[PDB]
């Protein structure tokens, strides 16, 4: 599924992400735009052999099992394919564990390089929330 901007804001809010660990909703929408262009089916392979999955591009070396990243952890206890569903619940629940682990949203390179320190409320402007 390719989400709209306000459609995704509303789903993320419903799932408890607005102000989760102090990050306003616009931070989460901005990160999903530059990580996946709002496409739940996005995958990208990294040099170390791991793969990033779904709307927030969650990595198989630490967070999910894809059966081809040797020595990897499955800290969200899910198959990586569950992160590609049109239902974002699994992605959201796993992202809450990542952002809680000490480094906040700096875990998402595109958030660090393209959202951090910008007017991120612009990403939810105009939406009926
Ligand atoms: Cl915001
Ligand atoms: Cl933080
Ligand atoms: Na893994």
PDB file of C-alpha atoms and ligand atoms in Angstrom:
ATOM      1  CA  UNK A   1       0.000   0.000   0.000  1.00  0.00           C
ATOM      2  CA  UNK A   2       1.181   3.537  -0.793  1.00  0.00           C
ATOM      3  CA  UNK A   3      -0.231   5.808   1.909  1.00  0.00           C
ATOM      4  CA  UNK A   4      -1.284   9.381   1.631  1.00  0.00           C
ATOM      5  CA  UNK A   5       0.414  11.845   3.954  1.00  0.00           C
ATOM      6  CA  UNK A   6      -2.650  12.584   6.118  1.00  0.00           C
ATOM      7  CA  UNK A   7      -3.915   9.013   5.906  1.00  0.00           C
ATOM      8  CA  UNK A   8      -0.621   7.818   7.386  1.00  0.00           C
ATOM      9  CA  UNK A   9      -0.615  10.543  10.025  1.00  0.00           C
ATOM     10  CA  UNK A  10      -4.034   9.382  11.190  1.00  0.00           C
ATOM     11  CA  UNK A  11      -3.063   5.699  11.312  1.00  0.00           C
ATOM     12  CA  UNK A  12       0.152   6.485  13.196  1.00  0.00           C
ATOM     13  CA  UNK A  13      -1.748   8.643  15.709  1.00  0.00           C
ATOM     14  CA  UNK A  14      -4.302   5.868  16.206  1.00  0.00           C
ATOM     15  CA  UNK A  15      -1.456   3.459  16.999  1.00  0.00           C
ATOM     16  CA  UNK A  16       0.019   5.708  19.710  1.00  0.00           C
ATOM     17  CA  UNK A  17       2.998   7.313  17.940  1.00  0.00           C
ATOM     18  CA  UNK A  18       2.122  10.986  18.534  1.00  0.00           C
ATOM     19  CA  UNK A  19       4.609  12.180  21.164  1.00  0.00           C
ATOM     20  CA  UNK A  20       5.886   8.621  21.716  1.00  0.00           C
ATOM     21  CA  UNK A  21       9.126   9.059  23.697  1.00  0.00           C
ATOM     22  CA  UNK A  22       8.793  12.785  23.058  1.00  0.00           C
ATOM     23  CA  UNK A  23       8.667  12.640  19.236  1.00  0.00           C
ATOM     24  CA  UNK A  24       5.754  14.561  17.741  1.00  0.00           C
ATOM     25  CA  UNK A  25       3.728  13.002  14.932  1.00  0.00           C
ATOM     26  CA  UNK A  26       5.436  15.077  12.248  1.00  0.00           C
ATOM     27  CA  UNK A  27       8.751  13.379  13.022  1.00  0.00           C
ATOM     28  CA  UNK A  28       7.267   9.950  12.243  1.00  0.00           C
ATOM     29  CA  UNK A  29       5.578  11.063   9.012  1.00  0.00           C
ATOM     30  CA  UNK A  30       8.782  12.800   7.829  1.00  0.00           C
ATOM     31  CA  UNK A  31      10.828   9.674   8.508  1.00  0.00           C
ATOM     32  CA  UNK A  32       8.364   7.449   6.580  1.00  0.00           C
ATOM     33  CA  UNK A  33       8.447   9.846   3.576  1.00  0.00           C
ATOM     34  CA  UNK A  34      12.211   9.750   3.159  1.00  0.00           C
ATOM     35  CA  UNK A  35      12.704   6.116   4.193  1.00  0.00           C
ATOM     36  CA  UNK A  36      10.030   4.481   1.981  1.00  0.00           C
ATOM     37  CA  UNK A  37       8.097   7.249   0.136  1.00  0.00           C
ATOM     38  CA  UNK A  38       5.091   5.998   2.169  1.00  0.00           C
ATOM     39  CA  UNK A  39       5.181   2.521   0.477  1.00  0.00           C
ATOM     40  CA  UNK A  40       4.669  -0.388   2.838  1.00  0.00           C
ATOM     41  CA  UNK A  41       6.302  -2.764   0.298  1.00  0.00           C
ATOM     42  CA  UNK A  42       9.702  -0.994   0.168  1.00  0.00           C
ATOM     43  CA  UNK A  43      12.820  -3.164   0.527  1.00  0.00           C
ATOM     44  CA  UNK A  44      16.490  -2.200   0.229  1.00  0.00           C
ATOM     45  CA  UNK A  45      19.611  -4.368   0.550  1.00  0.00           C
ATOM     46  CA  UNK A  46      22.646  -3.149   2.457  1.00  0.00           C
ATOM     47  CA  UNK A  47      26.333  -3.852   1.939  1.00  0.00           C
ATOM     48  CA  UNK A  48      26.581  -6.041   5.036  1.00  0.00           C
ATOM     49  CA  UNK A  49      23.948  -8.384   3.564  1.00  0.00           C
ATOM     50  CA  UNK A  50      21.062  -7.219   5.726  1.00  0.00           C
ATOM     51  CA  UNK A  51      17.842  -5.851   4.225  1.00  0.00           C
ATOM     52  CA  UNK A  52      15.595  -2.954   5.302  1.00  0.00           C
ATOM     53  CA  UNK A  53      11.805  -3.532   5.243  1.00  0.00           C
ATOM     54  CA  UNK A  54       8.602  -1.571   5.037  1.00  0.00           C
ATOM     55  CA  UNK A  55       7.368   1.915   5.653  1.00  0.00           C
ATOM     56  CA  UNK A  56      10.050   2.674   8.249  1.00  0.00           C
ATOM     57  CA  UNK A  57      12.795   0.510   6.689  1.00  0.00           C
ATOM     58  CA  UNK A  58      13.471  -1.686   9.667  1.00  0.00           C
ATOM     59  CA  UNK A  59      16.719  -3.678   9.419  1.00  0.00           C
ATOM     60  CA  UNK A  60      17.071  -7.488   9.457  1.00  0.00           C
ATOM     61  CA  UNK A  61      20.429  -7.475  11.255  1.00  0.00           C
ATOM     62  CA  UNK A  62      18.752  -6.552  14.563  1.00  0.00           C
ATOM     63  CA  UNK A  63      14.954  -6.388  14.435  1.00  0.00           C
ATOM     64  CA  UNK A  64      13.279  -9.070  12.258  1.00  0.00           C
ATOM     65  CA  UNK A  65      14.052 -12.477  10.748  1.00  0.00           C
ATOM     66  CA  UNK A  66      14.287 -12.868   6.980  1.00  0.00           C
ATOM     67  CA  UNK A  67      16.133 -16.195   6.909  1.00  0.00           C
ATOM     68  CA  UNK A  68      19.128 -14.812   5.023  1.00  0.00           C
ATOM     69  CA  UNK A  69      21.015 -12.496   7.442  1.00  0.00           C
ATOM     70  CA  UNK A  70      23.418 -14.884   9.238  1.00  0.00           C
ATOM     71  CA  UNK A  71      24.022 -14.204  12.919  1.00  0.00           C
ATOM     72  CA  UNK A  72      21.231 -11.649  13.056  1.00  0.00           C
ATOM     73  CA  UNK A  73      18.966 -10.850  15.967  1.00  0.00           C
ATOM     74  CA  UNK A  74      15.190 -10.830  15.804  1.00  0.00           C
ATOM     75  CA  UNK A  75      14.503  -8.346  18.574  1.00  0.00           C
ATOM     76  CA  UNK A  76      10.939  -7.574  17.403  1.00  0.00           C
ATOM     77  CA  UNK A  77      10.199 -11.336  17.160  1.00  0.00           C
ATOM     78  CA  UNK A  78       8.552 -11.118  13.736  1.00  0.00           C
ATOM     79  CA  UNK A  79       9.297 -12.271  10.236  1.00  0.00           C
ATOM     80  CA  UNK A  80      10.482  -9.323   8.188  1.00  0.00           C
ATOM     81  CA  UNK A  81       7.678  -9.972   5.687  1.00  0.00           C
ATOM     82  CA  UNK A  82       5.170  -8.908   8.378  1.00  0.00           C
ATOM     83  CA  UNK A  83       6.625  -5.380   8.034  1.00  0.00           C
ATOM     84  CA  UNK A  84       5.401  -5.160   4.437  1.00  0.00           C
ATOM     85  CA  UNK A  85       1.673  -5.538   5.221  1.00  0.00           C
ATOM     86  CA  UNK A  86      -0.865  -2.846   4.327  1.00  0.00           C
ATOM     87  CA  UNK A  87      -1.655  -2.866   8.069  1.00  0.00           C
ATOM     88  CA  UNK A  88       1.114  -0.876   9.777  1.00  0.00           C
ATOM     89  CA  UNK A  89       0.549  -2.352  13.254  1.00  0.00           C
ATOM     90  CA  UNK A  90       3.645  -4.591  13.195  1.00  0.00           C
ATOM     91  CA  UNK A  91       5.871  -1.810  11.871  1.00  0.00           C
ATOM     92  CA  UNK A  92       4.613   0.581  14.536  1.00  0.00           C
ATOM     93  CA  UNK A  93       5.050  -1.876  17.394  1.00  0.00           C
ATOM     94  CA  UNK A  94       8.605  -2.685  16.279  1.00  0.00           C
ATOM     95  CA  UNK A  95       9.461   1.017  15.758  1.00  0.00           C
ATOM     96  CA  UNK A  96       8.403   1.751  19.363  1.00  0.00           C
ATOM     97  CA  UNK A  97      11.003  -0.769  20.557  1.00  0.00           C
ATOM     98  CA  UNK A  98      13.737   0.778  18.356  1.00  0.00           C
ATOM     99  CA  UNK A  99      13.157   4.377  19.468  1.00  0.00           C
ATOM    100  CA  UNK A 100      13.208   3.273  23.131  1.00  0.00           C
ATOM    101  CA  UNK A 101      16.627   1.622  22.936  1.00  0.00           C
ATOM    102  CA  UNK A 102      18.745   4.675  23.739  1.00  0.00           C
ATOM    103  CA  UNK A 103      19.435   6.528  20.477  1.00  0.00           C
ATOM    104  CA  UNK A 104      15.902   7.751  19.790  1.00  0.00           C
ATOM    105  CA  UNK A 105      15.048   8.462  16.180  1.00  0.00           C
ATOM    106  CA  UNK A 106      18.745   8.759  15.237  1.00  0.00           C
ATOM    107  CA  UNK A 107      18.322   5.036  14.411  1.00  0.00           C
ATOM    108  CA  UNK A 108      16.766   6.240  11.110  1.00  0.00           C
ATOM    109  CA  UNK A 109      19.470   7.796   8.942  1.00  0.00           C
ATOM    110  CA  UNK A 110      16.971   9.604   6.760  1.00  0.00           C
ATOM    111  CA  UNK A 111      15.379  11.163   9.881  1.00  0.00           C
ATOM    112  CA  UNK A 112      18.789  12.343  11.105  1.00  0.00           C
ATOM    113  CA  UNK A 113      19.779  13.784   7.727  1.00  0.00           C
ATOM    114  CA  UNK A 114      16.454  15.156   6.426  1.00  0.00           C
ATOM    115  CA  UNK A 115      13.994  15.726   9.317  1.00  0.00           C
ATOM    116  CA  UNK A 116      15.976  16.470  12.497  1.00  0.00           C
ATOM    117  CA  UNK A 117      16.066  20.212  13.096  1.00  0.00           C
ATOM    118  CA  UNK A 118      13.490  21.073  10.414  1.00  0.00           C
ATOM    119  CA  UNK A 119       9.915  22.270  10.812  1.00  0.00           C
ATOM    120  CA  UNK A 120       8.463  18.765  11.014  1.00  0.00           C
ATOM    121  CA  UNK A 121       4.944  19.951  11.917  1.00  0.00           C
ATOM    122  CA  UNK A 122       4.696  20.871   8.236  1.00  0.00           C
ATOM    123  CA  UNK A 123       4.227  17.120   7.592  1.00  0.00           C
ATOM    124  CA  UNK A 124       0.855  17.058   9.384  1.00  0.00           C
ATOM    125  CA  UNK A 125      -0.349  20.540   8.401  1.00  0.00           C
ATOM    126  CA  UNK A 126      -3.769  20.539   6.802  1.00  0.00           C
ATOM    127  CA  UNK A 127      -4.647  17.060   8.070  1.00  0.00           C
ATOM    128  CA  UNK A 128      -7.855  16.373   9.990  1.00  0.00           C
ATOM    129  CA  UNK A 129      -6.502  14.831  13.202  1.00  0.00           C
TER     130      UNK A 129
HETATM  131 CL1  LIG B   1       4.636  17.520  14.612  1.00  0.00          CL
HETATM  132 CL1  LIG B   2      15.367  10.859  22.432  1.00  0.00          CL
HETATM  133 NA1  LIG B   3      17.452 -10.956  11.781  1.00  0.00          NA
END
